[PDB]
Design an enzyme around this catalytic site. Structure first.
Site, short mmCIF file in Angstrom:
data_model
loop_
_atom_site.label_atom_id
_atom_site.label_comp_id
_atom_site.label_asym_id
_atom_site.label_seq_id
_atom_site.Cartn_x
_atom_site.Cartn_y
_atom_site.Cartn_z
CD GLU A 1 14.13 -0.32 17.43
OE1 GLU A 1 13.59 0.34 18.49
OE2 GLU A 1 13.86 0.01 16.30
CG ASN B 1 6.51 4.58 21.45
OD1 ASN B 1 7.69 4.50 21.44
ND2 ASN B 1 5.70 3.37 21.05
CG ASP C 1 1.39 6.59 20.18
OD1 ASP C 1 2.04 6.02 21.03
OD2 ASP C 1 1.21 5.90 19.03
CB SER D 1 1.68 2.95 21.84
OG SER D 1 2.82 3.57 21.25
CG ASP E 1 8.18 0.94 21.03
OD1 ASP E 1 7.18 0.97 20.37
OD2 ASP E 1 9.00 2.12 20.93
CG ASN F 1 4.24 0.85 19.12
OD1 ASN F 1 3.49 1.18 20.15
ND2 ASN F 1 4.49 2.04 18.46
CG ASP G 1 2.05 -4.37 7.90
OD1 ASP G 1 0.95 -5.20 7.71
OD2 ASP G 1 1.61 -3.34 8.67
YB LIG Z 1 9.19 3.76 20.01
YB LIG Z 2 13.63 2.66 19.78
#
Ligand SMILES: [Yb+3]
Ligand SMILES: [Yb+3]
Ligand SMILES: [Cl-]
Ligand SMILES: [Yb+3]
Length: 129
Positions: free
Chosen positions: A35, A46, A48, A50, A52, A59, A101
């Site tokens: 990551e 991202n 959309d 958003s 990270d 996110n 979740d």
């Molecule tokens: Yb991402």
């Molecule tokens: Yb990633």
């Protein structure tokens, strides 16, 4: 801060991630490697709109507030900037909510694609735990 492999493993263990919801420490280290390359300051935008944040690339659409993601739910009740700290506490505490979740570590696409089903214990090999 850019963590060493065993340094991060030790920090994650201290914050209660070893076997959290049944995921061994190697899973968490593997996820962090792919990551963020162990870099607490990593950010990635991202499609959309958003973003990270941090060592586990949490996110802003769901988990933290960055002030520029309309309709963010901020479920971890934190500014996303707190997830970039050299102290991983905020990231760990939020990741504990994410993994609870319902979909487990599949919430992290890099984990699903690069860690899941592999010999993840290799990521803690040689470390003093
Ligand atoms: Yb991402
Ligand atoms: Yb990633
Ligand atoms: Cl699970
Ligand atoms: Yb031990």
């Amino acid at each position: 801060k850019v963590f060493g492999r065993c340094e991060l493993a030790a920090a994650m263990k201290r914050h209660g991630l070893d076997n959290y919801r049944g995921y061994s420490l190697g899973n968490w280290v593997c996820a962090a490697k792919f990551e963020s390359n162990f870099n607490t300051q990593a950010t990635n935008r991202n499609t959309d709109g958003s973003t990270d944040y941090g060592i586990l690339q949490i996110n802003s659409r769901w988990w933290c507030n960055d002030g520029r993601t309309p309709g963010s739910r901020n479920l971890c009740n934190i500014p996303c900037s707190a997830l970039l700290s050299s102290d991983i506490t905020a990231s760990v505490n939020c990741a504990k909510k994410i993994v609870s979740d319902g979909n487990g570590m599949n919430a992290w696409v890099a984990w699903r694609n690069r860690c899941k089903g592999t010999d993840v214990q290799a990521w803690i090999r040689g470390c003093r735990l």
